[PDB]
């Protein structure tokens, strides 16, 4: 009966190793009684117990007392010599009130709003969409809640992990390495680096120049950093902490969608622009995954392609299920040992001449001086800073290894046989695996405890089970879920679905012109053309002032005709989309009704606005909508057009 109470307590036990010298009993065996726990060090959900005529609740109280004794003993740490320089910049005593990491004081101070996209937002208002009923997106936070987020999320000790965990994770890696690439990676030239780089990439706290200014004028400074690291010499490594959606919350690289910003931690932590340049120039091939050596890495997969790709795997199983990865605050769960495992993997692929570079950078990353925007300093123990160049590749590989390990240990499948029974997909900490139902359910019921012991605790859920999808379109990935559409050529495919309320909110607002808005409308049309409401808002916006070209600040833009650009990447004309999955559409429209963001008139008013425009003489983008054209009697004839990134 008390099995759920024990299962909960086992998730508070310190991870331990296998104990052959004693009896290792589970939460079920404990709940049976006649089992006296001798220590709280948990291994695969089991602890050492003595056989001694014990009542179940007695065993529970002994285990709990053991956990509290252990917790009431697990200490301040010496600062590394290579971090001493930051103490020299301290001017005032600190007020972060951190409990588990040093707050040595505050350095001297150094020298964004959510506004409507007026055209997009007024098209919505014109149809009776109630903007003020849409959820809040891109919220900022004040200094007081920012420091609280630091105390809540970052101010912690490193996770304890199963003794010998990283040896096993390296064994998993050896089952998926690419030996033809061993010791082959070298730095890239400035020209290749500058091709894929956001020149607006943010300056660190002590920095004035952004990525582009440094590239134009201080390459020697970057090269000095590279040289120091290459020879194993310390650099003045630090990260700057800002609240999400602050002005310096800028992505160095192109992103596949706004989901990347949305999954960011509340606390953005990033190295200096000069230092990100130094890291990226040398480690380019790893941090950019050129080539892709992380199995299932979808970081480069456009969101309008991902679910068609995944459905082909799904169709190959007899009774497939998908098990979601749902780690709590992943970046705060990355340990020093985790980082050293990734370093060893990077040294596998890089030429030996960069091994000291990788050693020294990783050392700097194990104990990081972080300077808040307001000047407060904390010394972070391990973890991931979300603005590190290695965030996507390092987290993705760490996630793949940890999940393969956890799946194999839950199911009995050997590491080298994972690829025979399951397919994995990751984007940083986000992801899932597809496997046959029996294995998936085994993994979902045992994985919670195993993943906790591996230092990647899962979000707390019902009966401590990982989320299982029993039908393809219940998969969740990159904040989206598959939705099927029917094309006029008697085929079906999948698009990235998401709640209509959320899509509207993201489309309607930005953080601090029509050229930008038209790029947004095109970007959203590539993703959400399955959604008749989004589709028609997009077509109206794209109908605005045909003479102004789309801006290039967002995920995608079009050269020439946006309707032809759509066809180029989607594979059909917009006009050939004849049906969207009825059941899934209703699911993703529910919150429009719950929140009152629309009324019984909204869809017809938007249709009628499109028809009014499309019946008029001329070549109107709105007639690319199959139903609109059916009511207007006119079609859109596309010119030439191409989809571009950036």
Numbering used by the authors: 13 to 86, 89 to 125, 131 to 531, 538 to 671
What does the paper say about this structure?
Compared to the RdRPs of other Flaviviridae representatives such as the NS5 of the Japanese encephalitis virus (JEV) and dengue virus (DENV) in the Flavivirus genus and the NS5B of the hepatitis C virus (HCV) of the Hepacivirus genus, the pestivirus NS5B contains a unique ∼90-residue N-terminal domain (NTD) that does not have notable sequence homology to any other viral or host proteins. The global conformation of our CSFV NS5B structures is consistent with the recently reported CSFV structure with an RMSD value of 0.9 Å (95% coverage) between the reported structure and our representative C-682 structure. These structures together reveal that the NTD adopts a globular α/β fold with an α-β-α-β-β-α pattern. The NTD interacts with the palm of the RdRP core intra-molecularly with a mixture of hydrophobic and hydrogen bonding interactions.
The structures of the C-682 and C-672 were solved at 2.1 and 2.3 Å resolution, respectively, in the same crystal form by molecular replacement using the structure of the WT as the search model. We hereinafter choose the highest-resolution C-682 structure as the primary structure for illustration with difference between structures discussed where necessary. In the structures of the WT and C-682, residues beyond 672 are disordered. The RdRP core of CSFV NS5B is structurally consistent with the BVDV structures, with an RMSD value of 1.5 Å (92% coverage) between the BVDV NS5B N438 duplication mutant structure and the CSFV C-682 structure. Different from the observations in the WT BVDV, full-length JEV, HCV and the recently reported CSFV RdRP structures that have a canonical fold optimal for NTP entry and binding, the CSFV NS5B ring finger bent toward the pinky finger, partially occupying the template RNA binding channel. Although this conformation is likely not compatible with de novo initiation, normal activity of the WT and C-682 observed in the polymerase assays suggests that the canonical conformation also exist in solution and may be in equilibrium with the observed bent conformation observed in the crystal structures. The aromatic ring of Y471 side chain is wrapped around by NTD resides 23–27 through hydrophobic interactions and its phenyl hydroxyl group forms a hydrogen bond with the carbonyl oxygen of C25 backbone, while the carboxyl group of the E472 side chain forms two hydrogen bonds with backbone amide nitrogen atoms of residues M56 and G57 and its two-carbon aliphatic side chain region interacts with P27 and V57 through hydrophobic interactions.
